[PDB]
Design a binder for this molecule. Structure first.
Ligand SMILES: [Zn+2]
Lengths: 151, 57
């Protein structure tokens, strides 16, 4: 039977599967088509993240169902950056990222140069050259962004 | 069966109190209202409790 996998990047992938196929098998078929390693793939159906050892039938995924594919870094995690405007931005980072690395990702969302960003965590302003790991900043930690505005 | 806010980007259904999508990082819709009757799992409760700890300091 056929199922469809929709990516964020718009694209739709068509797969040939059996209800008995495991999520792992499905990711392998996506890798065969798109080159994406299964360990970087998150598949979503019925609002749930699908687990590798379950089958399509386990999730009641029927012929011509659409699954949604999101790509995530193998060793990554998320943190939140709260701004003084109340916007919360969610970022994918890893323990190895330096504060400078994190600022670069913030610049993509906020349009603010790193040299005008300050990040505060646990009452302390963070230093550019240190890692999230160094600061014991774990998954789902909230950092606070403050802007350095001229004048 | 999931309960929460659907990310309109990836269709993942998120914990009501999470500010951004657990799958794709997209921000929670501004129109979604956290239900007063939501009872967060222990990990999310502890996360929020941590945030609440920070404010008092
Ligand atoms: Zn999403």
């Amino acid at each position: 039977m056929q199922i469809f996998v929709k990516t964020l990047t718009g694209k739709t992938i068509t797969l040939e599967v059996e209800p008995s196929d495991t999520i792992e098998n499905v990711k392998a078929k996506i890798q065969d088509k798109e080159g994406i390693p299964p360990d970087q793939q998150r598949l979503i159906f019925a609002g749930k993240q699908l687990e590798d050892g379950r089958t399509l039938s386990d999730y009641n995924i029927q012929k011509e169902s659409t699954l949604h594919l999101v790509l995530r870094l193998r060793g990554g995690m998320q943190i939140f950056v709260k701004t003084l405007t109340g916007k919360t931005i969610t970022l994918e980072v890893e323990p190895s990222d330096t504060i400078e690395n994190v600022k670069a990702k913030i610049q993509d969302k906020e349009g603010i140069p790193p040299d005008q960003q300050r990040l505060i965590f646990a009452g302390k302003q963070l230093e550019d050259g240190r890692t999230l790991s160094d600061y014991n900043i774990q998954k789902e930690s909230t950092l606070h962004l403050v802007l350095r505005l001229r004048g | 069966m999931p309960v929460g806010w659907q990310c309109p980007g990836c269709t993942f259904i998120n914990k009501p109190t999470r500010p951004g999508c657990e799958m794709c990082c997209r921000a929670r819709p501004e129109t979604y209202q956290i239900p007063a009757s939501y009872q967060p799992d222990e990990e999310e409760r502890a996360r929020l409790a941590g945030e609440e700890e920070a404010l008092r300091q």
